Structures are given as structure tokens and as C-alpha cells.
Amino acid sequence: AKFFVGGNWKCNGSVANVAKLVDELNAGTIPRGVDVVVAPPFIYIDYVMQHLDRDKYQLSAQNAWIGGNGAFTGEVSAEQLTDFGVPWVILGHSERRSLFGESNEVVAKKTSHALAAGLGVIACIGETLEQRNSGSVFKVLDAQMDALVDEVKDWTKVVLAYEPVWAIGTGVVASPEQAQEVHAYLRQYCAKKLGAAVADKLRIIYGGSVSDTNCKDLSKQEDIDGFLVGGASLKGAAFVTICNAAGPKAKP
Amino acid sequence: AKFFVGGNWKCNGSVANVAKLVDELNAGTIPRGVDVVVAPPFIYIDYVMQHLDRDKYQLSAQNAWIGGNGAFTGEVSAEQLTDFGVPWVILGHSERRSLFGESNEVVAKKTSHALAAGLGVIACIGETLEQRNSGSVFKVLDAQMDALVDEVKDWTKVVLAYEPVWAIGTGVVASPEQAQEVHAYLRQYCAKKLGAAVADKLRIIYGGSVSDTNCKDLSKQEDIDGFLVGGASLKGAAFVTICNAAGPKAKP
């Protein structure tokens, strides 16, 4: 029910800058009834967990391994994250689908593994400019979702994040109307695959370029339940403003 | 000059188990003149850095991104690690060459980037059972090293780790004589590519199965300068014993 805002810091930070960002976030006020998650690089999670106000913010990781602990040098498991006290993980971000070749199948299995390990998952999908140019939007999104549906039985702790990758680094802007068109499409897909009750409660958050300038134009769209924020999450007051875009979608 | 032992914890740990392992490591005594590095999963680096005895142990990460900070969700940069106070990183581990498709070229560029960001690098190489079966040992190792040589000009802060991947998970054991044969081969390669002076000072550490049972048989081999330890690194007293295998190769 709650408007949901996640802040994906990506691969950014230093000890001093993280300390400063945490202080700025702690200075902000968040409306009742909004869920706000902050996702630092792995090395900072300890510090952030210990210094960021728990009344306002929950922690997320930016990725996790496909399975449990073992001989996977460099990786962090969902079991480790849960044991650490982290409640959320972002999985299938466009940067990992592209740079790391995470397939639809890998994202879906990471998601079911993480859920079974006790995390909530911000599961990311989205199509590129080439795919939109070729008339493949439905084919691509349907296949991304079909893979998730195959792995996930309980969507209570899933948040679905749509990334308009065609409008990320291409010189193209996505309008709020274009965003809403996709979110409406995803909503009706999910109603058919999961049932109208599950689809109505599922948070479908927008992960295009979200700033303190455009957040209210996006948050008023019928099927946009929140945001997965990129670079604006690195600026505390701007990020807090995005969290305050909930308006009537906050569920105090 | 110093015998060098790294402990690669891989994707293992919990809050309680890491606390226990750190206590066990702190209970151990290490000879003067041995460098010992411990590599936890990213999320534990903070805790380990703050609780593990600095007189005995330095920290390492198990991986880093190919470049600096930016839009690389899930990744940690070498710049972040240096700023955090971490002195070392493992790059090109066999599990990442295989599971993540890190090419010779990617490992070498990660290495030069990390060195430029101020880290020391444990650069890993090694050939598989298929490659040894096909008579490709030289071709594979030479190509792995040629890629490193192309990127790395200063080897002062590099430690070269040989992983006999043909003897890791295959049902085959590598003898100390087989280990030494490869290390001798690598030494003469490096003398030809880097100069005899650089090759003589370069630590070439063995990253096959290293335990407290076999460590002295390996450490006495002429061209084995230390170890990159896998599962035995999770057992504090066993790992400390491996560190004590240096004998005359400690440089107090």
C-alpha cells in the first residue's frame, strides 16, 4: 500500500561523503506511510546501518549472488545480507543485465533465492532503445516478467521496478505519460498472471531519471507507486524531496 | 622478500562466525617477516578492519570493478577500497574468470586500475584440467601473463597467485613437485618479460589446495613464495599454521 522510494547509490561514495550523505538524510523529514530504502555499496552498509535513522530509512544491498554461501570469490549472499540485518536487495538492475549479462532467468532465480533467504527484493526490468525501436517492448517486458513469475510464488515482499533503459544514457527523455503507459501495461500483465488482488497491492516503482524536479509529475500517475532513484539519491535534500512526492499515496 | 599468505574467505561468513574467526586469528602468533592478508566478503571489511590485530594482519577485498566510481550497480571500486583503508585486492580469481567470464584482458585492466588507485594486487592465473589435458598449459599461462605484463609496468605491489584449476574440484590432487614445476616456469617467464631483478623479488604464491597438512611440503619448494589459501582460511588455527610454514622464507 505504501508509496516506496529506493535510493540506489550505485558505485559511489567515500568515507567522508557517505558520512555527509547520512547526516543530510537524517536531517530530512519523511511523511508517515512512505517506505524509504537506501542502497549503499556493500562496504558502507555497516556504517550506514549504524548511523542512518531507522525510523526514516531501511537498508538495501545493490546485488546478491544467485545462491547460498560458498566458493564464489567476490560475491555476497542473500543469507549473509539477512544475517547482517539488511532487509532489502536490488536485483536485475539494468547495469547488471547489461554489463554482467544477467539473463531474465538469472534475475528471477536471484529473486526467488533472496526471498527464500528472508529479503525483500526490488526486482528490476526494462527495455532498451534498440528494443523500443524494433517494436519489441511487449516481447521484452513480457519475457522479463514471465521469468520472474516462473520463480516467484509470493509477491508480498517484491517491489517491481521499471527502468526505461531507452531513456537512460541515450539522449532520450521519458515523459510521465510514457512512464504511465508502461506501468499500466505492467499492472494488467500482473493482474492476469498473479490475480487482480496481488496486482493491485504490488508496488510498481519507476526507475527512469527521477529527480527533485520531476518527482511530482511522475508520482501522480495512476500506476506509479514510487521510485528507484539513481544519481539524485546522492544528494540528501533532493532525495528527501522525492520521498515527499508521495502525497495521497502515503498510507499513514 | 617476505613470504606472503593470503586468506580468501570467499563467499562465507555470518556476523557471529566472522566475530569468532577474528578472535581465533587474534589468538595466533605469526613469525616476524611474513606478510599475512585476510580477504572477507565486502560487507564484513569494516568489522574486520576494526577488530583484527593490525600488527599481524592486513585486509584485502576479493574483487573490485574495472574502473572508478560511477553507474555500476552492485560493484565496489578500487578507489573506494583505498579510501576505506584496505591495502590489497584479489583480482582474476579462477571463480571469477569462470563464473563471471573475466577475460585475461579484464583481469589485467582491473589490476592496472587497482594499482593506479593505490592498492596492492594479488593477481590470479591458472589453467584448467581441459587445458592441461590438451597440452595447452604454456599457451594458457603465457597468455594470462602476457595480458598482465601489457598493463602492469611496476610490479612492486603485485603478488602473482598460481591456481592449479586442474586440481580444484576435479578429483585430481596437485603434488608439491607439480606446483614447483609451474612456479619455476612462471619465474623464468617473468625474468624474460620483466628482468631478472623484478622476477627475483616477485612473490609467486600457490593457490591450489593449501591446508595445515600440506603447507610445509609446499613452502619448501624453491619458487613458492607463499599461499593464497581457500577453505582453510576459515579455520583460524589452521590458517595461522599455514602462516607459520614460512621457515627461512620469513624476512624478519
What is the CB neighbour count within 10 angstroms for residue B243? Answer: 26
Contact criterion met (CB < 8 Å) for B74 and A93: yes
Distance in Å, alpha carbon of A53 to nearest chain B alpha carbon: 19
State the amino acid at position B9 in one-letter form: W
Asked if A15 lies within 8 A of B77 by C-beta distance, the reply is no
Residues sharing a CB contact under 8 Å with residue A197, sequence separation 6 or more, in sequence order = none
CA distance B188 to B190: 5
Residue to substitute from B73, B95, B113, B163, interface A, most A β-carbons within 10 A: B73
Give Cα B75 distance to the centre of its chain: 20
Catalytic status, residue B183: no
Which residues does A179 contact at the CB level (< 8 Å), separation at least 6? A162, A164, A206, A208, A218, A221, A224
- The closest of A252, A245, A201, A251 to A227, measured between CA atoms, is A245
- Residue the block writes with cell 613458492: B224
Q: How many CB atoms lie within 10 A of CB B207?
A: 27
- Over the Cα atoms of chain A, what is R_g? 17
φ, ψ at B193 (rounded to 5°): -85, -30
* C-alpha separations of B166 from A229, B175, B199, B217 in Å: 45, 12, 25, 20
Instruction: State in Å, rounded, how far the first CA of chain A is from the last one.
Output: 10
Q: Chain A contact for B197, CB < 8 A?
A: no
List of chain B residues whose C-beta atoms are within 8 Å of the C-beta of residue A43:
42-43, 45-46, 76, 80-81, 84
Q: Is B15 helix (H, G, I), strand (E, B) or coil?
A: helix
DSSP string covering B68-114: SSBS-TT---HHHHHHHT--EEEES-HHHHHHT---HHHHHHHHHHH
Residue B224 region by backbone torsions, left for phi larger than 0, else alpha for psi between -120 and 50, else beta: beta
Closest CA to A76 of B114, B86, B9: B9
Measured CA to CA, the distance from residue B87 to residue A98 in angstroms comes to: 30
Phi/psi-derived region of residue B74, left when phi > 0, alpha when psi is between -120 and 50, beta in every other case: left
Taking residue A100's Cβ as centre, other Cβ atoms within 10 Å add up to 17
Give the CA diameter of chain B: 48
Helix ranges, chain B (H): 15-27, 45-51, 78-84, 94-99, 104-116, 129-133, 137-151, 176-194, 196-201, 215-219, 236-243
Q: How far is CA B9 from the centre of its chain?
A: 11
Asked if B185 and B141 touch (Cβ cutoff 8 Å), the reply is yes
- Chain A residues with CB under 8 Å of B101 CB are 101
Cell numbers for B132, please give them. 592441461
Nearest CA in chain A to B16: A83
Residue B237: count of CB within 10 angstroms of its CB: 11
Would you please indicate which residues of A are annotated as catalytic (active-site) residues?
93, 163
Whether A33 and B91 have beta carbons less than 8 Å apart is answered as no
Q: Is A195 exposed, middle or buried (0-12, 13-18, 19+ CB in 10 A)?
A: exposed
The experimental technique used to determine this model is X-ray
Please state the domain count of chain A: 1
CB B128 within 8 A of CB B46: no
Query: Residue B196 and residue B203: Cα distance in Å, rounded?
Result: 13
Q: Cell numbers 562465507 correspond to what residue?
A: B12
Q: For the stretch A48-65, what's the b/e string if a residue is b when 16 or more beta carbons lie within 10 angstroms of its beta carbon?
A: bbeebeeebbbbbbbbbb
φ/ψ of B203, rounded to 5, equals -80, 120
Q: Please give the residue range of the domain that contains residue B166.
A: 3-249
The CATH number covering residue B58 comes to 3.20.20.70
Strand partners, B230: none
Compare CB distances from A42 to B12, B42, B99 and report the shortest one's residue.
Answer: B42
Is B113 among the residues known to form the active site? Answer: no
Rounded distance between C-alpha atoms, residue A168 and residue A174, angstroms: 9
**Interchain contact A72–B (C-beta under 8 A):** yes
Point out the residue among A15, A47, A93 whose CB comes nearest to the CB of B73. A93
CA distance B22 to B37: 13
Rounded to the nearest 10 degrees, how much is the dihedral formed by the CA atoms of B141, B182, B219, B238?
50
> What's the Cα-to-Cα distance from B56 to each of B51, B205, B248, rounded to whole Å?
12, 19, 18
At a CB cut-off of 8 Å and minimum separation 6, what does A211 contact?
Answer: A232, A238, A242
